[model samples]
Target: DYVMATKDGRMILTDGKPEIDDDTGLVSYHDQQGNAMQINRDDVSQIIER
Candidate 1:
């Protein structure tokens, strides 16, 4: 699990994990342990995308 900080200074606990593409070594978002979530960086209202 990764801890995310919001633009408002609030902290959020997320089960989001990082995965590397098989071909490219670039990191991307992956499913959590057993849950699914979606977050959009472009529409962030109070959180900043890292």
Candidate 2:
């Protein structure tokens, strides 16, 4: 929904919303080449909106 135009490898929000048993969030977005990474992370922040 939002971006600062930086690689910012750190992911904030996914599929819209915060974390804690929200695995589905990870696959919400895609890479520049259109690839979604299946990563299991817990430290998500700086959630921006569209």
Candidate 3:
């Protein structure tokens, strides 16, 4: 169980602590392995927190 954000093009699984940039509308988070990932806010299709 993890934070899952499904985008228009793909899906992203984060560590349940994803952050959004207010200025740029960019979403950022770390995965289970601690690798950083970022995506455009508008591209997000859905978000699930577990």
Query: Candidate 3 — which residues are off by over 4 angstroms?
Result: none
Model 2 lDDT tens row, 2-48: 32122355553333322234645442344454444443342233445
The digit string of per-residue lDDT tens for model 1 on 1-50 reads 46545446555555555443546344344333544544444322332353
Comparing 1 and 3 on lDDT, the stronger one: 3
Report the poorest 10 consecutive residues by lDDT, candidate 1: 39-48
> For model 1, which pairs clash?
none
Candidate 3 per-residue lDDT over residues 1-50, each given as its tens digit: 25565655456566756788879988777787897687777776667532
TM-score (all chains, Cα) for each model: 0.34, 0.32, 0.61
lDDT of 1 at 20: 39
Model 3 clash number: 0
lDDT of each: 0.45, 0.39, 0.69
